DNA sequence: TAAAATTTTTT
DNA sequence: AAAAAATTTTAAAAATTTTTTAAAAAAAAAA
DNA sequence: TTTTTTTTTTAAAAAATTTT
């Protein structure tokens, strides 16, 4: 009853290599309007808005609205069976509590086809409403990940003293200090590696470090991370696949 | 032994404690002070305060804590000799008394600890009675035998015959938690050698050299100064700390041109005062010969180690033959030549 | 102290070599230039650090200031630098806190750190400038695999040098090792040339640990100036094109 | 005895292969070629190993001597050498060692090793060959891919096989996983060859961490011979080029 | 047998 | 008012398994 | 042709519990 094959396998694997290590457990919410994951996390920190459309996938429909129980440890573990050209056959049925996955090889002659284990969990709808945000950062996604990856070493806290000018990262911890501060590129002419700033007012929030080196396995989704914060409202992290829809993580300042 | 030797040297002499690491030795012949490790390790050895109680009734927990910290040693490159006890002098029993009035004043805190019902002042006061007997020292003595691990005992006191062994130069330092080995004369100590904390607790190593050129002294001036602040067989004059008996020591220089020149009234001298009966039997105690003993190293036997410690106290077998097995191997290895041998020091920069 | 560097991934490298043998030394900053000379934590192996001032991009020294680093904090902050990273390394007047930049190339990240630090007390080892008897130069990355194999079967390697060959000799429970180098004559290149300045006949034994510890250093050249003489400690010296040398002592067994 | 091989990677494989999988095994070198006949350190598995003279550059092994040797030891040891060497086995009749001469290409680290021996006394005279039903020529990285993502469902593969392909089950507490595999004849490409010549089909359960531990071999060749029968212990041979084979047997359930 | 904490004098 | 004390209180352990992060290192895939 | 992550397989701490 439930169908949803994609020829690009490798952006689901990058999906669940971003959300295995945070979320235990989450509710698959598939509308026929495209496939969405409401996920608060284990620790009960940082909230989770995946979202694929239906013109991401190549053959997709549904019949009614599913919300089934993933183990997302497993369907990591199911998910790293696949390849990177490979294709994915996503497939679901009404009386049976199992998601089946088919991953078959183009080039070659192979096919693959996986069963899960699903489990009843309650559902969990936190929907966030949407403003125009004060900050928005699009800044290159491995930057980021450099970022994070490199102030994790000093402190715990991260404070982004951003401005219209440039953004800076700032963290302190007993080992020391570390700014770092990028200017906003306009000379570069490519749209990827340029860190975009769009403000109307300078911001000041301090961040916890090991959610951001947690949100940070998204990069190989996509070129460009997309922060957008303001004075109260948590951070969003947006991983805005190409052709599919966004990864979005919320992060509670301290 | 001193209330506050160590801090007047870490306030006068802050290059005379080395803070050299535990891997640092390897052909350093290493004196230990044994009791005061047996007293320490029958402390934190604890059940929740009954220590190793077997199916005997005797406590074995000097025995295993001694055992697991002399494979650390030899694992190491350390080269202990364990120098016990012997008999103390009177200006010592003092001392003793007043400790045994202190330990029978803990037993007296310790009725209504135990009438309370509280765990932990029951297990602080059984720490406070902690005390050595003859068949302990003789398993001690029995266990160094084992592993052949050299034994050594002093007519008067330990700290007395390491001092003059690192005095010989047949070990390189004496290691121990008091400062009674710089009174009694060694050059170098190495306090605080545990077994474990390498990154957080470093070794404070005492030079006496340092000492002596940075105070201007001569030895027998440090004795005094160390009669002045406080030993365990002479008292203090009158509130005469550190600073104060820096103060006579960089005048007066000698005990008695300190005694004769200081006021009647302002800082009396204590009656019944014997400072000339604590200053030679620092410079001259009744210590055993060095050359008359040995110092071997040898490879111990392994059946005799297991039908000892699991035959008469019924400990585990795994641990102690892996202990033995890299003890055997830290031991079976050729030396190691210490770069501080081929290099001269030129001085430090200290940041 | 301002010390602009034209790559900064030296001194990364640096930082990557002294993080795993050194926790806490102190760097003797002068007007000629970057230097560290200290000891090992277990008092076998010391390190020769020399960084001229005909490296730098620009370097101005008033005093010869020195400063009480933890290597293992200095190396998780030059672990934040890239590889074409332009840093320099910053401390003004009464300096409580080494300070970094690490200017990006293209200009779009400069990462500025701060890093504090402890007073400390390492003893600083008087060496002469030894003739010395056989001086062994190879590969950098040959060494480095020499050592990392030898370690499998013991700890102790046994340098031999014969008048034409040096002789890698380790022993364990696991075997025999013996690792034979002649000198090259047919090859004649800068980075594989194994060649030995010849005097006289050696034959000591190092531990094998230390010399995993000094073969982190493998990416800073390819150069291994193994100079060394009889009963006088090895020079394992990892010569930077341009800035200095990086002098490893190991006293031997 | 004398053997002398060019490719020095093939034996440093075989030796990563049987590293994790047998502790001690006879080396039974006979004058045909060096074989290793061998049960498993969890006695389960079978390895039979045969390496023939004619991959070996220089062979002059005249007495028929077998000796046993520790393979984590061994395997360490061929660690020692490089990725691509001139291995030069050599033993003596009266000593009890197997040295090992690993001449690297460049021939200047002529690196010469030793190794003792733990002899033993291993039944080789059980040997399984005789007529099977279904054989599985498939390419290597595949199988290892196939074990590798199996592991991770549980720890039991059904092995189905039919003339239009074969088929690998697994269940678990993860979920159920059938990897169907199809025949593709793929002339002139091996990337793909996926031949199956199927007489009797046959569906039967084995344990996933041995073939983790058979599929460590696939460095060796490119193809794996999967060959099983009903009620068989299953074969997994690996063809080394000209130069041997290495058949791993595993009864199942 | 050690260190520090808190109140106490000396200057 | 700092300095310099003398009272009072506190504390003394080594290590395998087991449990999480940091980390080399050959082995994936990169420019 | 050595890197960057990636994955992997050991290893560092860091604790509660023991080593009877």
Redesign the pocket.
Known sequence: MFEARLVQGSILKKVL?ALKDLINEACWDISSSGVNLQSMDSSHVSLVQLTLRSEGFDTYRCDRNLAMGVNLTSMSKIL?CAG?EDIITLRAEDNADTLALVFEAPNQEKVSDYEMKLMDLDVEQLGIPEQEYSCVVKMPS?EF??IC?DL??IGDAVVISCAKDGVKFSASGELGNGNIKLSQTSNVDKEEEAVTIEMNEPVQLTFAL?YLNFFT?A??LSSTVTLSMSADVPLVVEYKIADMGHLKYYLAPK | ???????LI??VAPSAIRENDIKSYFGRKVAIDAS?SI???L?????GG??????EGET??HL??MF??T??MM?NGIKPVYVFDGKPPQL?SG?LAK?SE?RAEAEKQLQQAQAAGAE??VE?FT??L?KVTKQHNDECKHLLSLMGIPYLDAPS?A?ASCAALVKAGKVYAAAT????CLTFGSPVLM??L????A?KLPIQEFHLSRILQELGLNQEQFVDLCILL?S?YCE?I??????????LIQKHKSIEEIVRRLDPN?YPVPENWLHKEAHQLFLEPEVLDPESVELKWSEPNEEELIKFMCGE???????IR??VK?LSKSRQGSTQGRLDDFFKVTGSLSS
Do not use: C
């Open positions: 290599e790293k990177n491995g990940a450099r990856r994790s070493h090991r396995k990069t190989p | 032994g001193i209330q506050g030797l160590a801090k870490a306030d005061m007293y320490q390790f402390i934190a050895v604890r059940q009954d220590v190793l109680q077997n199916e074995t927990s295993m804590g697991y910290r494979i650390r694992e010592k001392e400790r202190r932990q002042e602080k720490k406070r902690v006191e700290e938690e008091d400062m009674d306090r605080h545990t077994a474990s904390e990154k406080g365990d203090s009158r509130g005469i700390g550190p600073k104060r008996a820096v103060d302002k106290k019924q400990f585990s077998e795994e641990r892996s202990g890299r």
